[PDB]
Structure formats: structure tokens, C-alpha cells
Amino acid sequence: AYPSFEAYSNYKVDRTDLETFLDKQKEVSLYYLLQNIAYPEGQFNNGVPGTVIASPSTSNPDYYYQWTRDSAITFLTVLSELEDNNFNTTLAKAVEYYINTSYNLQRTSNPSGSFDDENHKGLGEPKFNTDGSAYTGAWGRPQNDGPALRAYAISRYLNDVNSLNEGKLVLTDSGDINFSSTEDIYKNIIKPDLEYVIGYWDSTGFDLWEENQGRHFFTSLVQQKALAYAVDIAKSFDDGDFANTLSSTASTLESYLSGSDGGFVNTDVNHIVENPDLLQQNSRQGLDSATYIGPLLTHDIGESSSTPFDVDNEYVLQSYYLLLEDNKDRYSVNSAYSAGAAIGRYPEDVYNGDGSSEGNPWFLATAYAAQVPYKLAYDAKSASNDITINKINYDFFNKYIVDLSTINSAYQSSDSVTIKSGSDEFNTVADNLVTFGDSFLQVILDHINDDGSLNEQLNRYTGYSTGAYSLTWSSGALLEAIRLRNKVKALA
């Protein structure tokens, strides 16, 4: 049951036209995203302001909780909307309420620990109840991606306040808020999460799927990004010694991510191994949609990101191709798709959205899979950068994008093919990347509920929606796909 849910009234998806669907859904999915955020001006005006529910599903399954990860990822979508529009003050108020609630949750003792523990050990706690109290039941704790994604989101709001709102906050003359300046947010809310990541990046915790403990590519990547991005924030508040702590730590984590201690880059299999400890146990072989979701979250197109493992990395793109090819054979629903297809979490998954049997494809994974080729095209065309295709990725490009012997007849004798910006083949490759990305959004249009809401999962046989209803992260993933598609279609 999902008692709180309110459909977008008298809307029904049009399944006959992708273009019309994406134009309309841009508004519809934002309505469903904002419905799950408490803020006085919103639909969810009875919750504690700044609370993000993962889903209105309160049973079968029960996802009516606030997780640090889903709240942060939700607000990266809110931030993109704030950046693209006029620093809309309604949306900015919602971000400041989330910053305030985040301050309170940081200071809430829970089963992971408390704020006064070494390097604020309680900040690894994955989820809290909707009234802001601790979740005391057994859970896969800690999860060390959450404080990194929260630190990145709130850092990014400070950069936008400085650049779009002349350095001013929107909730300054309010008595309900626990900060009165950008420096207060940095010292009191951003720094404590970056201290957590400095203290605990080389420590064991649970992955983003909340299932296994050990080394995880996504977790380390989103930590590296939070630290790197915060360097210039810290400098701006005259926190120079901490800036250089962050710089040094970010470089150290970069080396860990790309070396044999981390174990994620596996040149025996030539793809990323998302969870290397489960490869040692022989329990999973390493393919996971988290391998390309992390790259996408950590390289927003509106930044000039230094951080490693963008989606043009050969081992990330090989994990993406090999998961695609797995899922096209694995899920019967995908028999009528010849390009993109419905994608799940990892090939070994047994979670069926409300128990264990056989895993299913996920709407969020499918929406991120559209973003991979959209970003490859956008990064080339927007900047007039050449496209360089490494030999490990030739099979992917020949099967789905372009025949590489039509570009260079001797390509199999070289280690890479470089397609030059401006050339006719470059325009073909970029348009074919976009059309490939659209094929994943066509899968979503085939199987979305008629009311425009997105569940967590779609059944592997039929494609009918299943699991948690109107999952906030699903809505967000589709909104970011539509955003990237409109940005690259505006260049042609």
C-alpha cells in the first residue's frame, strides 16, 4: 500500500510517441519527485521540512523512510532544476530545509554511532524514520557513500548560492533554521561529513544496494568526488590547511581506486569489478549497474570535473556493455529489443521487490543506461573534443553504434580509433549515440505506469511495474536522462 500517493490528475502516458512523452514527463516526473519531499509550499506539507521519503510504499514493500543516499541524489536533481531555471526561490527553500534537517540528523545518535564519536561515526547510518528518529532495527550499516553524496550536494548548493544568488541564503530571517550564513553551513554541516569520509574511507561497510560488506567501487568513487569538489569551498572560507588535507586525501583515494589495493580495475576480465571481495568468495563476478551510475553522479555536465572514471573510461564502458548483453539474454521481457533494453542491478540478484526469488530489471538502472551514450555525445560535441575509442570497447561500438571498418579499414591493428571533431563520421557517431540512448527511454515508455509514476522494478517476464511505488530515485534518474537528452539535442 502507498496511502500518501496522489496521482497527477487525469494524465495517462502516450505510448505512441517518445518525443511527446518526454516533453510531458519532464513536468510529471518532477511533480512525483517533489511530492516525496516535505516543504511547506509542497504537497507533502505535513512532514518535517527537508524530509525526503524514498517511496510512499508503507507495506509490501515498506520503503517509507529517509535514506541519506536517496535524499542527496534527489537534491542533485533539485539543484539541476535550480541551475537551469532562475534560481527559483521555492526550490531553493526546499534545499535549505534539507540542509537544516541534515544538520539535525547528523546530531541524532543511532546504532552506527553518534556525532561525538571519533570522526562522527554516527554519520554512516543509512536511514532514519520520517520523523527524524533513529531506525533501531537491524540493517546493513554503515553505508559510507551517504555522507559523501550529502557533502557534494550541499557543497554544490553553496557554489550555486555564490554564483546565482550573490552569496545570499533564502531562509535568512527565519527562526526555524540552524545556520545564518554560508560559512555556518560549511563549518557545521559540510565539514563533519568530510571528516567522516577522511576517517572512514579505508574502513568496511555496506554497498548502495544495502546487501554486502567490503570494498565497493561506487562508494570509493563518490567519496573521492566529495573530497576533490570541497577543496575550493574550503579555500574560500579560509580553511587552507583543511583544503590541502582534502586535496591530499582525494589524490590518495584516486590511487586506491585505480590500483591493486582497491581491486576494481581488473585487467584479467577487462571490466570493473564492483565488489572485489565477492569475486574472491566466488559469489559475484563483478558486473553491476552501480559501475556506471557512480560515474554519472560524479561528472555532472555543468562542471569541469577532474575526477577519475568518467563514462568514457574503457573499463566502465566494458562493464556497461557486458551488463547490457547479460540482461538482454536474462530477462524475457527484453526479447523484443534489439538495441538498448531493460537493465537490472547485477546478474546474481535475487531480490524481486518484496522478497527473494529471481531479480528484475530496475527503472533507475534503465534510465541511467540511457545517460551513458547521451553523455559521451554531449561531452564530444559541446566541447568540440575528438571521440577516442579504445580497443577493449571495439565490440560495443561495432555492435550498437558504428561499423569501425567504415572509418578506418585497419582499425583492428591499432590500439584505438580517433574520430575527429567536425568530420562527417563524428556527426554520425554522435547522432547514433543519441539514438542508442533513446532506445532505453523507449523501454521505459513501454512499461511505465499509466499515471506516469515509476516503481523500483519492472517484472522480468512481462515488464509490468513491481516493488516500491513512485520511487524518488526512479523519478530523479528519468529527469536527469531527459535533461541530458535536451542538452545534446540543443547543439544540433
What does this structure look like?
Belongs to the glycosyl hydrolase 15 family. One of its GO terms (molecular function) is glucan 1,4-alpha-glucosidase activity. Its EC number is 3.2.1.3. The chain has helices at 18-35, 68-84, 89-106, 146-164, 182-200, 217-229, 231-236, 240-258, 276-280, 290-297, 314-330, 363-383, 394-400, 424-447, 472-489, and strands at 66-67, 127-128, 205-206, 213-214, 265-266, 271-272, 387-390, 416-419, 457-458, 465-466. The strands form five sheets. The protein has a two-stranded antiparallel ribbon with strand order 1-2. It has a two-stranded antiparallel sheet with strand order 3-4. With 492 residues, the protein is mainly α. The longest helix is centred in the last third of the chain and has 24 residues, at 424-447. The protein is globular and about 65 Å long. The chain is 47% helix and 5% strand. The termini are far apart. β9 and β10 form a beta hairpin. It has one domain (1-492): Glycosyltransferase (Alpha/alpha barrel). The relative contact order is 0.11. The protein has 15 helices and ten strands.
Write out key terms for the chains shown.
15 helices, glucoamylase, EC 3.2.1.3, Glycosyltransferase, hydrolase, globular, two-stranded antiparallel sheet, monomeric, 492 residues, mainly alpha, glycosidase
Write the layout of secondary structure elements.
Elements: H1 18-35, E1 66-67, H2 68-84, H3 89-106, E2 127-128, H4 146-164, H5 182-200, E3 205-206, E4 213-214, H6 217-229, H7 231-236, H8 240-258, E5 265-266, E6 271-272, H9 276-280, H10 290-297, H11 314-330, H12 363-383, E7 387-390, H13 394-400, E8 416-419, H14 424-447, E9 457-458, E10 465-466, H15 472-489
Antiparallel strand pairs: 1-2, 3-4, 5-6, 7-8, 9-10
